[PDB]
Amino acid sequence: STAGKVIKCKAAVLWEEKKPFSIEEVEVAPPKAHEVRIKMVATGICRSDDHVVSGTLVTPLPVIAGHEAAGIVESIGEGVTTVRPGDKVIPLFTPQCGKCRVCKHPEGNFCLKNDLSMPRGTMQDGTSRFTCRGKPIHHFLGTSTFSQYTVVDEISVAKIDAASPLEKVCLIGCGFSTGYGSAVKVAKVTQGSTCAVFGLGGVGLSVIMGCKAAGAARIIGVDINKDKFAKAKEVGATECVNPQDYKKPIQEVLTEMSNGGVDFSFEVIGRLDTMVTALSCCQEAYGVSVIVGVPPDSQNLSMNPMLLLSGRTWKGAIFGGFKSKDSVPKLVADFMAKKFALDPLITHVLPFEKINEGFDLLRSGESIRTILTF
Amino acid sequence: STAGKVIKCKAAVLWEEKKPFSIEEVEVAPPKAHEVRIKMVATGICRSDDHVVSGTLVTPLPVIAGHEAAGIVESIGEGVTTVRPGDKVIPLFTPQCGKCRVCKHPEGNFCLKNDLSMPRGTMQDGTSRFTCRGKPIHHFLGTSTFSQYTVVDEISVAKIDAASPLEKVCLIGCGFSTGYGSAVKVAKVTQGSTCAVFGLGGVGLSVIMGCKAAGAARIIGVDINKDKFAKAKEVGATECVNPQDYKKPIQEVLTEMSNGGVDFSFEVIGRLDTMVTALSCCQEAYGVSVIVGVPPDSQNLSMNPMLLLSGRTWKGAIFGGFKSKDSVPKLVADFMAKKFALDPLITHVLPFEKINEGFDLLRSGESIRTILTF
Ligand SMILES: NC(=O)c1ccc[n+]([C@@H]2O[C@H](COP(=O)([O-])OP(=O)(O)OC[C@H]3O[C@@H](n4cnc5c(N)ncnc54)[C@H](O)[C@@H]3O)[C@@H](O)[C@H]2O)c1
Ligand SMILES: NC(=O)c1ccc[n+]([C@@H]2O[C@H](COP(=O)([O-])OP(=O)(O)OC[C@H]3O[C@@H](n4cnc5c(N)ncnc54)[C@H](O)[C@@H]3O)[C@@H](O)[C@H]2O)c1
Ligand SMILES: [Zn+2]
Ligand SMILES: [Zn+2]
Ligand SMILES: [Zn+2]
Ligand SMILES: [Zn+2]
């Protein structure tokens, strides 16, 4: 039994920006009150984990990254009531405390206990459960899933179906839920509408899935890598366009194609220029544009507010607008009942020990999601 | 008899930017097919008319400005079916053709026949009905209400109750409808919510009226002119703040006052900086901010898109989101049935010959709405 004891295990530690991960031994403390220690089973490689390496997404270093994952509870701290040893779980990078003004609001999901807005890289109590080479290591988004074992606060974990295939449903911990919810919950895509989706990676393909589920008549995929078009069409895109093929700006192209602007547009990349382009291509009187991508830290965009005065709506969201702990178990149940598919997002599988090759695949443009198995 | 003949009458001509209006004789041609010639009875002085003088709003000069008014039909051109000679009418600076994609959409109101996006300063047929000293004079937003007689396209006029008081209901042609609709239709203010309103002129006071009608619990007025506060409280503000009284940015003040950000905020001034401040002060996960003010031509704002990624919604609108020809007659009927008040907006009632004095009252901070009577 390991309950109440320190666990020594392997993790992928990031000591420095712009360097490979280091797979080495870490010490994982036992859970304190209202904490849960999880044996990880599978984790996806999401572009936000790469943003930590590139310095796009700022969080304290050294760190154990990873936020899209699934595993099995090893032990629970005092007072935990929502999970037990042996349960299958998904860590929640957006917590759901259930008690703050956001958690009590009908639409809000960005719980005030989050570690996203002004990151500390700690547990809720301001301390760390990890040491490596005798030095304390930061957490990432309260989850730190690039480790054989992690410790999370109870408000950052959801119990899921015991029969769930963890190597698939890890994607409900970030990319699938974010893109799908951005379409069905945040934008509220309507039947018969025209949508434009900028960026055709795992999250943008999930936005396409949600637009098709909502009954859109036209779904235009936009990417500078034409090798992403075939899979976009498989999951519902009706047409795809590469901005590099055109002499005019793509907002003009899209407005012409849609006979005056699209109903719904989505930025699913992380660039300031494509956020403004995506807003401009929606119809000026009644269009809606949703920002999903994460841009380089602390940088401001420039835009003309007359784009809004005519009638456009501009919004963003984290995790598809879903209240995390209520929604994740229901999304897994819907997956088990074949209400949506996850296999189209999975292009590569590797053992955890080959995490750096998995990041190389993402950076080269070759992969959508690589799933790592422990 | 004036029907079918050129009319000579007085108008306020603006020959160049940054000069007083010239009150002099103009010639007004008879209406062509699908056009309506109107004898003006009352017109309000709105800040957007002043924006033409100051160069904030670019439109072809020389011009007859004025867009908030009410009058009586003098004659109709061939083919007109919606008004007749002797009817009371309000000119519509946002048209409603009924046939374009926007007019057919459930939410949109920015009809594609508008002269707001890329102003030509003409009738729909690309010509002008006004001459002055032998020279052609431009129209303004298809309305040109600063003249004893004007000619408007049929899609730019609504028939209203024959018993309505024209010296009051002229406000339904711009300021009342814009502010009220921005609250009740565009933002969709909810019962029990907290609202912040930036700018306490005629339009901002109308936003307050709409927030109170919608059941808001708290309505915080924001203005650098504290002389505006008493009237704001009379029409529903619960508190008023002056940014110049504080050592920290007003977005921080308003976030603290609202225990973490307001539900709804409104920019009703026309400044880039207050547009970004108003967005920032709404709650980061579920707040909504609406731009109503018109800022200086061709100038971009700078903002951090993380303000939207957390969950905020940013939108703007023209004319409160109301489909103009359908809505104006109903708003007049609602006024006649005592559903809202217009008197609180009116501080001064002057003859038309005093237009320049009326603009000086607005610029000095001393008036809300001056109504000019012909
Ligand atoms: N808001 C949230 O809650 C949330 C959660 C999921 C991920 N993220 C963000 O979502 C974004 C997408 O993540 P992903 O894992 O799908 O990434 P990804 O890298 O797999 O996909 C991005 C796609 O954008 C395309 N692209 C890059 N530059 C482009 C340009 N200039 N024009 C057009 N296309 C361009 C790429 O070719 C690529 O296919 C990232 O910024 C990530 O950080 C946000
Ligand atoms: N979107 C539309 O359809 C629409 C229709 C109505 C008018 N407009 C615009 O609405 C705005 C308001 O019009 P109005 O007639 O009520 O104007 P107004 O001049 O009567 O009122 C503006 C108010 O803003 C306050 N103000 C100015 N600078 C400020 C600052 N830095 N901080 C705080 N308060 C400040 C002033 O003291 C004043 O009370 C204008 O820009 C006008 O052009 C837009
Ligand atoms: Zn919470
Ligand atoms: Zn992610
Ligand atoms: Zn129309
Ligand atoms: Zn106006």
Blueprint of the fold:
Two copies of one chain form a homodimer.
Chain A: E1 7-13, E2 22-28, E3 35-44, H1 47-54, E4 69-76, E5 88-91, H2 101-104, E6 130-132, E7 135-137, E8 149-153, E9 157-159, H3 166-169, H4 175-187, E10 194-198, H5 202-213, E11 218-222, H6 229-234, E12 239-241, H7 250-257, E13 264-267, H8 272-281, E14 288-291, E15 301-303, H9 306-309, E16 313-316, H10 324-336, E17 346-351, H11 355-364, E18 369-373
Parallel strand pairs in A: 10-11, 10-13, 11-12, 13-14, 14-16, 17-18
Antiparallel strand pairs in A: 1-2, 2-6, 3-4, 3-8, 3-18, 4-5, 5-9, 6-7
The structure holds nicotinamide-adenine-dinucleotide (NAD) (2 copies) and zinc ion (4 copies).
In short:
The structure is a homodimer of 374-residue chains. With 374 residues, chain A is α/β, with parallel strands linked by helices.
Q: How is the quaternary structure best described? A: homodimer
Distance between the termini of chain A: 20 Å
Bound molecules: nicotinamide-adenine-dinucleotide, zinc ion
Instruction: Classify the secondary structure makeup of chain A into a structural class.
Output: alpha/beta
- Largest interface, chains and sizes: A-B, 40 and 40 residues
The helix/strand order of chain A is EEEHEEHEEEEHHEHEHEHEHEEHEHEHE
Which CATH architecture of the largest domain in chain A is right?
Alpha-Beta Complex
The gross shape of chain A turns out to be: globular
Level of helix content of chain A? 10-25%
Number of helices of chain A: 11
Strand percent estimate of chain A: 15-25%
PDB class: oxidoreductase
Keywords: oxidoreductase, oxidoreductase(NAD(A)-choh(D))
Assembly: dimeric
Entry title: atomic X-ray structure of liver alcohol dehydrogenase containing a hydroxide adduct to NADH
